[PDB]
């Protein structure tokens, strides 16, 4: 469990600092990220998904 927690931390840190990939689309480019900002929407959706999975 300790090793898995450390590796999950390093994994999520790499995902956070190397930005996420995206699918090709209308406004999408190799140089930008199109989506939603964290604060109002992304945290809300993540918490709702967490609650649903626990349920």
């Amino acid at each position: 469990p300790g090793i898995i927690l450390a590796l999950i931390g390093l994994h999520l840190a790499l995902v956070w600092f190397q930005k996420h990939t995206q699918f090709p689309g209308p406004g999408r480019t190799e140089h930008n990220v199109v989506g939603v900002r964290v604060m109002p929407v992304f945290a809300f959706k993540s918490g709702a998904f967490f609650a649903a999975i626990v349920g």
Partner: peptide, 13 residues
């Protein structure tokens, strides 16, 4: 059920 919830919450294209 988890994948259906993901399909409902997220988008697709």
């Amino acid at each position: 059920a988890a994948i259906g919830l993901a399909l409902w919450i997220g988008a697709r294209s």
